[PDB]
Paper text:
Therefore, we kept e = Ala in most designs and made g = Ala, Asn, Gln, Glu, Ile or Ser to sample oligomer states of 5–8 and internal diameters of ≈5–10 Å27,34. Despite the requirements for aliphatic residues at a and d, up to 40% of these can be changed to other side chains without compromising barrel integrity. We introduced mutations at one or two of these sites to generate four groups of αHB: Group I had entirely hydrophobic interiors, but with different sizes and shapes of channel; Groups II and III had polar uncharged or polar charged residues, respectively, at specific points along the channel; and Group IV had aromatic residues installed in their channels. Finally, one third of the designs were crystallized and yielded 12 X-ray crystal structures, all of which were open αHBs with fully accessible channels.
Residue numbers in the entry:
A (entry chain B), B (entry chain A), C (entry chain B), D (entry chain A), E (entry chain B), F (entry chain A): 1 to 29
The structure:
């Protein structure tokens, strides 16, 4: 459903957010 | 409908959050 | 519905988060 | 009911996230 | 329900995110 | 089912976000 599809997109963006925060952590180190 | 539309907006804002975090990461690099 | 109303509030806060991260990026630059 | 209550709590935490990011931005400024 | 249980976990993680951002703000100060 | 599974993935990514923010906080400390 349309709900599920949007939640999938939300998950995708959160994965990218996680990735960028890992990059930030690495840079600060 | 309405729930899907709000989830779409949530996904849009998360995409912008991901973008800004990438900018921050790039600046630290 | 009540679900939709809370999702709308969630979207609002995510927009503010996006805005503040843009401000942070600008400050680091 | 219960879904609305959890979304309300999600909105509350996102508001706190927005607040803390504003604090970080203000500190960088 | 299963939806409610996952939203509860989402709220929990957002609370931790809020806490860590407060810690970050305190450290920058 | 499918909505629960996507919310589970959303919770998983938020847990990773919380973890990375803790790393950032620890680095600032």
């Amino acid at each position: 459903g349309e709900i599920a599809q949007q939640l999938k997109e939300i998950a995708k963006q959160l994965k990218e957010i996680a990735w960028q925060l890992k990059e930030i952590a690495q840079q600060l180190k």
